[PDB]
């Protein structure tokens, strides 16, 4: 559904839309992986 | 054109048969004043206009 675009290469430091023409996009980082792991652990330890 | 014709006659005693005008790109007007055949432009320019 959504297209995951990396913040690497020609996509580092872009304020807006990258060159991937899609209706919905999500940009991801290394620093998200720390946060997503923390959010997953908090969900696993509270469910 | 009428004001240039009167000013040349009243001040410098210069008769004109035709006056042409353009506005230069600087925003200033340039007037071409052709004289009557009786007078000479070289005589008037040397006498009054101070031009060789």
């Amino acid at each position: 559904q959504v297209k995951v675009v990396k913040a690497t290469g020609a996509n580092r430091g872009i304020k807006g839309r990258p060159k991937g023409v899609k209706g919905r996009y999500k940009m991801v980082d290394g620093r998200m992986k720390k946060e997503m792991r923390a959010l997953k652990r908090l969900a696993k330890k509270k469910r | 054109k009428a004001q240039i014709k009167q000013a040349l006659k009243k001040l410098y005693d210069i008769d004109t048969v035709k006056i042409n005008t353009l506005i230069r790109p600087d925003g200033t007007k340039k007037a071409f004043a052709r004289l009557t055949p009786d007078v000479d432009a070289l005589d008037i320019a040397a006498t009054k206009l101070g031009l060789v």
Partner: protein, 121 residues
């Protein structure tokens, strides 16, 4: 080339217009001649330009002085000759209108004014 304002105040209207005509005629002939040999003639241009301004400011000032004498005892003056002040101060009530009091107030101040007194210690 420079006229003196002290000389111009003594002269009358016909002499002032003749001098103004002379300066304009002198400037116009020398403006067609300033196209070449721009030297001390340029100082003559600047002096003549200031001289015309001096004759114009004394022609206008004497005319305004005569009009003020004409309108000395007239109810309405031209708007140029009226004092300027501010817009608020021209719509402010006059000194005689602001100081006007009712005659019942004037009678009370006539017979019972504020007195001068002292209290011992």
């Amino acid at each position: 080339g420079k006229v003196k304002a002290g000389q111009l105040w003594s002269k009358n209207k016909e002499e002032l217009t003749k001098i103004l005509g002379e300066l304009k005629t002198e400037l116009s002939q020398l403006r067609i001649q300033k196209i070449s040999s721009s030297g001390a003639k340029l100082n003559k241009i600047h002096d003549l330009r200031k001289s015309i301004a001096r004759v114009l400011t004394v022609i206008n000032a004497k005319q305004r002085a005569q009009l003020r004498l004409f309108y000395k005892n007239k109810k309405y003056l031209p708007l140029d000759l009226r004092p300027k002040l501010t817009r608020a101060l021209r719509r402010r009530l006059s000194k005689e209108d602001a100081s006007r009091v009712l005659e019942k107030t004037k009678k009370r101040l006539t017979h019972f004014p504020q007195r001068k007194y002292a209290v011992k210690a």
